[PDB]
Amino acid sequence: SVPSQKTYQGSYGFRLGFLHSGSVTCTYSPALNKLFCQLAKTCPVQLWVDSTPPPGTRVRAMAIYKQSQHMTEVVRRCPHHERCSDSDGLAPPQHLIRVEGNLRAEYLDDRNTFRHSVVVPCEPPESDCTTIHYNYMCYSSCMGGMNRRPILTIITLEDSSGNLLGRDSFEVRVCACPGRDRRTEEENLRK
Numbered sequence: 001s002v003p004s005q006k007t008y009q010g011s012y013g014f015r016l017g018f019l020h021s022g023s024v025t026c027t028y029s030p031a032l033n034k035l036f037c038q039l040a041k042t043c044p045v046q047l048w049v050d051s052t053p054p055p056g057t058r059v060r061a062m063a064i065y066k067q068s069q070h071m072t073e074v075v076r077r078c079p080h081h082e083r084c085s086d087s088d089g090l091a092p093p094q095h096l097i098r099v100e101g102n103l104r105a106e107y108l109d110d111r112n113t114f115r116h117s118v119v120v121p122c123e124p125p126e127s128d129c130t131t132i133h134y135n136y137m138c139y140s141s142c143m144g145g146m147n148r149r150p151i152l153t154i155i156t157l158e159d160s161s162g163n164l165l166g167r168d169s170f171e172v173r174v175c176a177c178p179g180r181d182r183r184t185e186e187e188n189l190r191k
């Protein structure tokens with residue numbers, strides 16, 4: 001089974017956004033639709049809707065491998081990092097993606113597909129945007145985990161039953177030098 005990655009604004013006009021960045025622990029490339037971040041550092045992601053969704057609407061994040069030959073493999077923390085004593089009290093140690101600073105985050109191990117995801121209630125903005133803070137708890141290069149394979153994060157807006165209301169996505173590289181790696185990959189896209 002493979003989760004869909006098709007962008008879908010839906011009835012509420014749902015989409016993601018990133019603030020600008022160029023020392024950096026996280027930086028987003030619009031040209032590559034790709035977030036570059038350090039291990040276990042805050043990644044702020046903005047959520048936009050055109051219209052306020054109903055109470056009980058939630059926002060779920062899930063990682064999948066980007067390459068088609070790995071898409072059925074569950075993205076999980078590597079054998080090293082899953083044994084770290086780095087629990088926040090809520091995230092199970094196998095989950096790559098955490099939400100920080102939200103006590104209502106729930107973590108799902110899907111009983112059928114075995115995929116991991118983290119979901120929070122969707123709340124109205126303060127402002128014009130809602131921000132969620134994600135952490136990525138493994139490097140892209142971790143052997144026995146992502147093993148240098150690219151991943152996508154899929155962000156879904158869902159009703160209280162889990163039915164799809166909206167979807168957006170971005171590629172992620174978790175690496176020691178996000179600013180340098182962004183500049184290298186944007187230069188490759190240029191040439």
Ligand SMILES: *c1nc(F)c(C#N)cc1F
Binds near residue numbers: 019026
């Ligand atoms: C890290 N990464 C980003 F993409 C942003 C933005 N916008 C902020 C940050 F700290």
Ligand SMILES: *c1nc(F)c(C#N)cc1F
Binds near residue numbers: 083
């Ligand atoms: C996992 N957990 C830790 F606590 C450390 C340290 N120090 C490293 C690690 F990979």
Ligand SMILES: *c1nc(F)c(C#N)cc1F
Binds near residue numbers: 049053057123130
């Ligand atoms: C989630 N939930 C909401 F209520 C809004 C609004 N308004 C945005 C969102 F991303």
Ligand SMILES: *c1nc(F)c(C#N)cc1F
Binds near residue numbers: 048128129
């Ligand atoms: C705040 N948050 C967002 F996600 C967008 C977009 N797209 C715009 C905004 F002002």
Ligand SMILES: [Zn+2]
Binds near residue numbers: 078138139
């Ligand atoms: Zn790891």
